Specification:
monomer; 321 residues; alpha/beta; Rossmann fold; eight-stranded mixed beta sheet; six-stranded mixed beta sheet; globular; binds 2-amino-2-deoxy-alpha-D-glucopyranose; solute-binding protein; ABC transporter solute binding protein; enzyme function initiative; EFI
């Protein structure tokens, strides 16, 4: 064994989070690290306390996905000062250095979602008009902040589309259900609802159903690729799911961990991570790998490369030498 790695996961409340524990644990194990997971259960002060605890344990590395991206900056600094490598998973922290960061191309995921919304709202006469209800996730999470930026950039170019945006605080599907019910009663002309993770869409479907809607009446889209999302595609409720590449983000951390722990430089460039072109840059917050997401529709929903089909790579993750 090469040592222990602590993963500070923000919650265990959807398939991405629990999937990330499983993938990081398995992949790191393939490259000779034992992973231990601590769950913040959506409490910032818990995760901050967990950081102190783990710093005291002096592990080979810490993997953090911050509950709140502004709140954790001091903890990151403390860990690194104690000589412990810190890796950011999924939730990008740009305001202080980390030793590695592994994220989806989130602005690009918002762009893809934007392109599909536009396509979905384009009318017979070539114009783009309608009303979109957008349901971001928690404001403390750069994943949704950056998807929102990309999405809005696309949609704003077509001012005949009105957009209503209401975040689901703490990523709660229950909030999303309330939002969809209240907003649809006030705006019967909502044509499309874009939610930033598929577990939110599950609540949206129930809210639509309770208002008498059937699959396809209101177009629906979400943006993380979770299994419940792909199942809503198959059932006709969801028009599009723009996945983030969970397995690849996890695999990349395992692939580069020897370099992180060895304090060896991580060279900028294009890498293959589980078949995806993954881009490493040197940023002010340290080495960063950005891995692309993809749009999933009924036409390609069964592609085993998409993590919501729960067919992880068969072959050995290997350390980057
Ligand atoms: N990128 C992840 C999503 O996949 C996930 O749904 C939320 C909530 O767990 O956290 C992060 O934002």
């Amino acid at each position: 064994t090469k040592g222990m790695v602590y993963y500070l996961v923000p919650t265990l409340l959807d398939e991405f989070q629990t999937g990330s524990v499983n993938a990081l644990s398995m992949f790191l194990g393939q490259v000779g690290y034992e992973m231990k997971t601590l769950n913040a259960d959506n409490k910032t002060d818990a995760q901050q306390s967990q950081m102190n605890d783990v710093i005291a344990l002096k592990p080979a590395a810490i993997i953090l996905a911050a509950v709140d991206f502004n709140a954790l900056k001091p903890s990151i600094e403390a860990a690194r000062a104690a000589g412990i490598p810190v890796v950011e998973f999924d939730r990008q922290i740009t305001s202080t250095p980390s030793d590695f960061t592994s994220v989806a191309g989130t602005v690009e995921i918002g762009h893809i979602a934007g392109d599909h919304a536009i396509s979905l709202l384009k009318g017979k006469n070539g114009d783009v008009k309608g009303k979109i209800l957008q349901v971001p996730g928690d404001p403390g999470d750069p994943y949704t902040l950056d998807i929102q930026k990309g999405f809005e950039e696309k949609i704003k170019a077509f001012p005949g589309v009105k957009i209503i945006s209401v975040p689901a605080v703490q990523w709660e599907a229950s909030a999303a259900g309330t939002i969809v019910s209240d907003q649809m009663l006030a705006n019967p002309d909502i044509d499309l609802i874009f939610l930033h993770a598929a577990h939110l869409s599950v609540a949206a479907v129930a809210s639509l159903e309770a208002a008498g809607k059937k699959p396809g009446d209101v177009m629906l889209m979400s943006s993380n690729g979770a299994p419940v999302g792909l199942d809503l595609i198959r059932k006709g409720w969801l028009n599009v799911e723009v996945e983030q590449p969970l397995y690849a983000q996890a695999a990349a951390i395992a692939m580069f961990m020897d370099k992180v722990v060895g304090k060896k430089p991580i060279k900028a460039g294009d890498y293959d991570v589980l078949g995806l072109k993954s881009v490493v840059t040197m940023e002010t917050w340290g080495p960063n790998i950005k891995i692309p997401g993809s749009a999933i529709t009924k036409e390609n929903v069964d592609n085993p490369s998409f993590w919501g089909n729960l067919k992880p790579p068969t072959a050995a993750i290997k350390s980057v030498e």
